[PDB]
Write an enzyme that holds these catalytic residues in place. Structure first.
Site, PDB file in Angstrom:
ATOM      1  N   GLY A  13       6.649 -49.009 145.455  1.00  0.00           N
ATOM      2  CA  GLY A  13       5.405 -48.435 144.981  1.00  0.00           C
ATOM      3  C   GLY A  13       4.317 -48.808 145.954  1.00  0.00           C
ATOM      4  N   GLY A  15      -0.248 -48.927 146.393  1.00  0.00           N
ATOM      5  CA  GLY A  15      -1.524 -48.826 145.729  1.00  0.00           C
ATOM      6  C   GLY A  15      -2.694 -49.040 146.654  1.00  0.00           C
ATOM      7  N   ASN A  16      -3.834 -49.372 146.055  1.00  0.00           N
ATOM      8  CA  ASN A  16      -5.027 -49.750 146.793  1.00  0.00           C
ATOM      9  C   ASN A  16      -4.723 -50.901 147.744  1.00  0.00           C
ATOM     10  OD1 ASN A  16      -4.999 -50.683 143.782  1.00  0.00           O
ATOM     11  ND2 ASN A  16      -6.013 -52.365 144.876  1.00  0.00           N
ATOM     12  N   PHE A  17      -4.622 -50.591 149.036  1.00  0.00           N
ATOM     13  CA  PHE A  17      -4.551 -51.556 150.127  1.00  0.00           C
ATOM     14  C   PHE A  17      -3.235 -52.320 150.177  1.00  0.00           C
ATOM     15  CE2 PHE A  17      -8.788 -50.331 150.076  1.00  0.00           C
ATOM     16  CZ  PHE A  17      -9.453 -50.761 148.940  1.00  0.00           C
ATOM     17  N   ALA A  18      -2.209 -51.884 149.443  1.00  0.00           N
ATOM     18  CA  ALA A  18      -0.963 -52.638 149.405  1.00  0.00           C
ATOM     19  C   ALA A  18       0.213 -51.727 149.075  1.00  0.00           C
ATOM     20  CB  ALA A  18      -1.028 -53.782 148.389  1.00  0.00           C
ATOM     21  N   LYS A  19       1.396 -52.171 149.497  1.00  0.00           N
ATOM     22  CA  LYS A  19       2.659 -51.556 149.124  1.00  0.00           C
ATOM     23  C   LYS A  19       3.652 -52.663 148.810  1.00  0.00           C
ATOM     24  CE  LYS A  19       2.910 -50.751 154.125  1.00  0.00           C
ATOM     25  NZ  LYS A  19       3.599 -50.055 155.256  1.00  0.00           N
ATOM     26  N   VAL A  20       4.622 -52.349 147.966  1.00  0.00           N
ATOM     27  CA  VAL A  20       5.721 -53.256 147.662  1.00  0.00           C
ATOM     28  C   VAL A  20       6.997 -52.605 148.166  1.00  0.00           C
ATOM     29  CG1 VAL A  20       7.033 -54.418 145.839  1.00  0.00           C
ATOM     30  CG2 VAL A  20       4.530 -54.244 145.678  1.00  0.00           C
ATOM     31  N   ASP A 128      -3.819 -58.184 132.036  1.00  0.00           N
ATOM     32  CA  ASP A 128      -3.444 -56.775 132.261  1.00  0.00           C
ATOM     33  C   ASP A 128      -2.000 -56.544 131.815  1.00  0.00           C
ATOM     34  OD1 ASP A 128      -3.991 -54.080 133.002  1.00  0.00           O
ATOM     35  OD2 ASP A 128      -3.414 -54.424 135.080  1.00  0.00           O
TER      36      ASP A 128
HETATM   37  C1  LIG Z   1       5.193 -51.629 143.238  1.00  0.00           C
HETATM   38  C2  LIG Z   1       5.067 -51.182 141.773  1.00  0.00           C
HETATM   39  C3  LIG Z   1       4.739 -52.313 140.750  1.00  0.00           C
HETATM   40  C4  LIG Z   1       4.335 -53.587 141.129  1.00  0.00           C
HETATM   41  C5  LIG Z   1       4.058 -54.576 140.180  1.00  0.00           C
HETATM   42  C6  LIG Z   1       4.185 -54.318 138.825  1.00  0.00           C
HETATM   43  C7  LIG Z   1       4.613 -53.049 138.420  1.00  0.00           C
HETATM   44  C8  LIG Z   1       4.879 -52.062 139.370  1.00  0.00           C
HETATM   45  N1  LIG Z   1       6.229 -50.373 141.274  1.00  0.00           N
HETATM   46  C9  LIG Z   1       5.965 -49.038 141.022  1.00  0.00           C
HETATM   47  O1  LIG Z   1       4.856 -48.585 141.219  1.00  0.00           O
HETATM   48  C10 LIG Z   1       7.080 -48.206 140.466  1.00  0.00           C
HETATM   49  N2  LIG Z   1       6.818 -46.893 140.167  1.00  0.00           N
HETATM   50  C11 LIG Z   1       5.686 -46.491 139.290  1.00  0.00           C
HETATM   51  C12 LIG Z   1       5.289 -45.025 139.552  1.00  0.00           C
HETATM   52  N3  LIG Z   1       6.438 -44.132 139.343  1.00  0.00           N
HETATM   53  C13 LIG Z   1       7.625 -44.571 140.113  1.00  0.00           C
HETATM   54  C14 LIG Z   1       7.984 -46.042 139.841  1.00  0.00           C
HETATM   55  N4  LIG Z   1       8.240 -48.739 140.294  1.00  0.00           N
HETATM   56  C15 LIG Z   1       8.488 -50.066 140.627  1.00  0.00           C
HETATM   57  C16 LIG Z   1       9.759 -50.598 140.443  1.00  0.00           C
HETATM   58  N5  LIG Z   1      10.083 -51.846 140.724  1.00  0.00           N
HETATM   59  C17 LIG Z   1       9.142 -52.682 141.209  1.00  0.00           C
HETATM   60  C18 LIG Z   1       9.541 -54.071 141.456  1.00  0.00           C
HETATM   61  C19 LIG Z   1      10.793 -54.617 141.353  1.00  0.00           C
HETATM   62  N6  LIG Z   1      10.793 -55.969 141.637  1.00  0.00           N
HETATM   63  C20 LIG Z   1       9.538 -56.282 141.862  1.00  0.00           C
HETATM   64  C21 LIG Z   1       8.907 -57.521 142.175  1.00  0.00           C
HETATM   65  C22 LIG Z   1       7.573 -57.528 142.364  1.00  0.00           C
HETATM   66  C23 LIG Z   1       6.836 -56.299 142.242  1.00  0.00           C
HETATM   67  N7  LIG Z   1       7.366 -55.148 141.958  1.00  0.00           N
HETATM   68  N8  LIG Z   1       8.727 -55.155 141.768  1.00  0.00           N
HETATM   69  C24 LIG Z   1       7.839 -52.255 141.382  1.00  0.00           C
HETATM   70  C25 LIG Z   1       7.496 -50.924 141.103  1.00  0.00           C
END
Ligand SMILES: C[C@H](c1ccccc1)n1c(=O)c(N2CCNCC2)nc2cnc(-c3cnc4cccnn34)cc21
Length: 313
Positions: A13, A15-20, A128
């Site tokens: 995913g 967002g604002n100024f970051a990606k995971v 949150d």
């Molecule tokens: C980055 C963001 C996120 C970050 C933090 C909290 C919630 C979501 N994220 C989404 O946006 C998303 N999207 C939403 C929009 N539609 C498609 C699916 N699916 C996700 C699935 N897995 C993770 C995941 C799994 N292990 C970890 C460990 C740390 C952080 N993240 N993370 C994060 C996801």
């Protein structure tokens, strides 16, 4: 696309100024999740907020909270290397499958309540809590994530409006944990019904419903579940139940004989497993180096390797 000891892979995913991104640790082969934060786009208060989030993640060590393994920092970028939860958001799970049966909601909710009550033990409020911030690991265990808006309890933030306590809508100053308690009532309702208890066509309509505090009980919802919701969704924060008290509730513990939910007791971290330390010497790090990083708990490349060696693959 490498950073430190990690190979970066698919984006989870952004967002604002970051990606995971999901990633693989090169030395151990374990998967991790890496948050990549562009510091250059942040002002000094955003920067301070970022370093507070890191400090909160270092404080919290619970099996249903995403764990921090390592911090890598350049002058432009911050990398948070974290536990990876392979089954995504509870939000998306409810969208795909609809409501959970109460026995399935109960297993998840016991984990959620344990994690958040433990945060409150540490004087941290998440602020949150919502279905989107509850992740699921490969075994469908809850992992609470994203403490970017969290704080210590001893600003003018208001999280996702459908989960916000009524005192937040009135702009009132508030202590801390009571607002997490309200959000957890909204979470319980969404797990068992698949829908939000308070909704509206716009913020004005939603706000009025939250302040009235009335919500619909479906015919399939048990009396015990309805009664438990009443302990969370109390308009007056003074009279809202605390999580330590709510842990004793009949619904929480139905079918859990000899296993009543209780406050989590954080174990002493083993930083002395010589089998793991022997592996790291064979990788190249010295015995004295490993001891110094673990004892100061530096969240560096060494302590992250030690932790990851302690997990499955
Ligand atoms: C980055 C963001 C996120 C970050 C933090 C909290 C919630 C979501 N994220 C989404 O946006 C998303 N999207 C939403 C929009 N539609 C498609 C699916 N699916 C996700 C699935 N897995 C993770 C995941 C799994 N292990 C970890 C460990 C740390 C952080 N993240 N993370 C994060 C996801």
């Amino acid at each position: 696309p490498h950073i430190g000891n990690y190979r970066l892979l698919k984006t989870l995913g952004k967002g604002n100024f970051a990606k995971v991104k999901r990633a693989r640790h090169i030395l151990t082969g374990r998967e991790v999740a890496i948050k990549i934060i562009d510091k250059t786009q942040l002002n000094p208060t955003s920067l301070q907020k970022l370093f507070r989030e890191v400090r909160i993640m270092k404080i919290l060590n619970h099996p249903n909270i995403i764990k921090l393994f390592e911090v890598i920092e350049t002058e432009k970028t911050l990398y948070l290397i974290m536990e990876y939860a392979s089954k995504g958001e509870v939000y998306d799970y409810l969208v795909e499958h609809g409501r959970m049966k109460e026995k399935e909601a109960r297993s998840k909710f016991r984990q959620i309540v344990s994690a958040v009550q433990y945060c409150h033990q540490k004087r941290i409020v998440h602020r949150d809590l919502k279905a989107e911030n509850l992740l699921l690991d490969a075994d469908m265990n809850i992992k609470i994530a994203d403490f970017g808006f969290s704080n210590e309890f001893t600003d003018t933030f208001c999280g996702s409006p459908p989960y916000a306590a009524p005192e937040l809508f009135q702009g009132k100053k508030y202590d801390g944990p009571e607002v997490d308690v309200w959000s957890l009532g909204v979470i319980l309702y969404t797990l068992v019904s698949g829908s939000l208890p308070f909704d509206g066509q716009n913020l004005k309509e939603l706000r009025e419903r939250v302040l009235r505090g009335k919500y619909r009980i479906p015919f399939y919802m048990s009396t015990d579940c309805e009664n438990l919701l009443k302990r969370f969704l109390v308009l007056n924060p003074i009279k809202r139940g605390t999580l330590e008290q709510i842990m004793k509730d009949r619904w929480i513990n139905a079918g859990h004989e000899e296993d009543e939910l209780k406050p989590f007791v954080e174990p002493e971290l083993d930083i002395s497993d010589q089998k793991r330390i022997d592996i790291m010497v064979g990788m190249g790090y010295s015995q004295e180096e490993i001891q110094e990083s673990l004892s100061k708990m530096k969240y560096d490349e060494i302590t992250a390797t030690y932790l990851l060696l302690g997990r499955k693959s």
